[PDB]
């Protein structure tokens, strides 16, 4: 409950500002003129918001909710920029790892379960072919990916443990999350109850607050890129499209259903497309299907710029309100991109039940803890045809991936 927003003030108002803003806001919800849409509680909310901000000792302890976060992030930025400036390189070698099965393949390259012969531990290893990456004009996205992932550190982001290259491949070794992708469960359980969705969505919300404070845009929020760990919590993978963006940026990339309008249109965009995608994720989670689909992507982009979302009937009224505000086609009105930034999502009626402190601390009861079968289980994961990895006797594209 943010007293500063309830009084429509900024964290640095003066002592007269809170007294007049209290009198300006108490009349706009007075129990005699605007005692209509149940706003007698918005009036009490204003009444309690003055009593705390008027008291310089009550205000000081309240100002320690923001300041704790402001500091938490400051140190996280500093820890990020030290790693950004000196990105780890060649921190392992292929022949340290026993290649087990394949865990997934696709538009990136190949992700296999591996085993470090010595520490006898379990990792995911993503193999990218240098020649195919330069083929897919994805050299700058691949270099980014390793650089943003080795430098970030957050409970809900997968952790890159090692990285290295040989003559024709780029190798990336990260923590092994065994519970499988949220996609496979969301399509087996059919959909998610609104509290279940609220669980995952809050982690995405804290993770986007972290990433955006680092000036990062993630640009691939999708249930196929979220994993569930043994505590039922969320681990994000695929940083193939993540960019460090202090201003605007222009690449149309992502996944058609999840693209914000401004990505599809030729105007630049900001972090705010990550909040749009979050609206798609909460919608697909709570309904079973994404808000905009079609067999041809251009028809998906027609729906996306229409600014028309049909909501399902079992969609709560508070969810319908949060979604109307995340799927706003005008990024100058979209939630997350307004004056109070992410706090508009956090202090929203659909998120009144949720403890952002406790969600961070991994304390909450995860409404679904997947099936555990020991150390190397690939049961929560589809099977794939195995290829053998050839290693050319000539270095390929040594110039393009110097930085890797």
């Amino acid at each position: 409950k943010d007293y500063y927003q309830t009084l429509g003030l900024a964290r640095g108002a003066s002592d007269e500002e809170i007294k007049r803003a209290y009198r300006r806001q108490a009349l706009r919800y007075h129990p005699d003129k605007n005692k209509e849409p149940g706003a007698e509680e918005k009036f009490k909310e204003i009444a309690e918001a003055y009593d705390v901000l008027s008291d310089p000792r009550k205000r000081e302890i309240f100002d320690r909710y923001g300041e704790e976060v402001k500091e938490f992030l400051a140190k996280a930025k500093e820890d990020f920029l030290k790693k950004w400036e000196s990105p780890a390189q060649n921190t392992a070698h292929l022949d340290q790892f026993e290649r087990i099965k394949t865990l997934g393949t696709g538009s990136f390259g190949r992700v296999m379960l591996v085993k470090h012969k010595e520490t006898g531990n379990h990792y995911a290893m993503k193999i990218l072919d240098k020649q195919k990456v330069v083929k897919l004009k994805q050299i700058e996205h691949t270099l980014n990916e390793k650089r943003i992932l080795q430098a970030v550190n957050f409970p809900f982001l997968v952790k890159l443990e090692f990285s290295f290259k040989d003559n024709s491949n780029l190798y990336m070794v990260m923590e092994y999350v065994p519970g499988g992708e949220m996609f496979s469960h969301l399509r087996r359980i059919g959909r998610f109850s609104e509290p279940h969705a609220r669980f995952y969505a809050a982690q995405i919300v804290l993770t986007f607050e972290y990433l955006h404070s680092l000036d990062l845009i993630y640009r691939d929020l999708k249930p196929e890129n979220l994993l569930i760990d043994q505590q039922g919590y969320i681990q994000v993978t695929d940083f193939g499209f993540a960019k460090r963006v202090k201003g605007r940026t222009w690449t149309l990339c992502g996944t058609p259903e999840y693209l914000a309008p401004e990505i599809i249109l030729s105007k630049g965009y900001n972090k705010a497309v990550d909040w749009w995608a979050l609206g798609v994720l909460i919608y697909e989670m709570a309904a079973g299907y994404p808000p905009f689909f079609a067999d041809q992507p251009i028809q998906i982009y027609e729906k996306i710029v229409s600014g028309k979302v049909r909501f399902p009937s079992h969609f709560s009224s508070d969810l319908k309100d949060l979604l109307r505000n995340l799927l706003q086609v005008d990024l100058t009105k979209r939630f997350g991109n307004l004056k109070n930034g992410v706090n508009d999502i956090k202090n929203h009626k659909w998120f009144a039940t949720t403890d952002w402190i406790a969600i961070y601390q991994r304390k909450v009861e995860a409404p679904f803890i997947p099936k555990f079968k020991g150390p190397g289980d690939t049961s929560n994961f589809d099977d794939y045809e195995e290829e053998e990895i050839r290693v050319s006797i000539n270095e390929k594209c040594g110039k393009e991936f110097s930085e890797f």
């Binding site: 696709g106 538009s107 691939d220 058609p256 079609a294 067999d295 399902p312």
Partner: peptide, 20 residues
Amino acid sequence: TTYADFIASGRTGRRNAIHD
């Protein structure tokens, strides 16, 4: 119905990304 349309649109599988 929408659900029947979602099974229709061939997009109930893993969605590959676009690099455009």
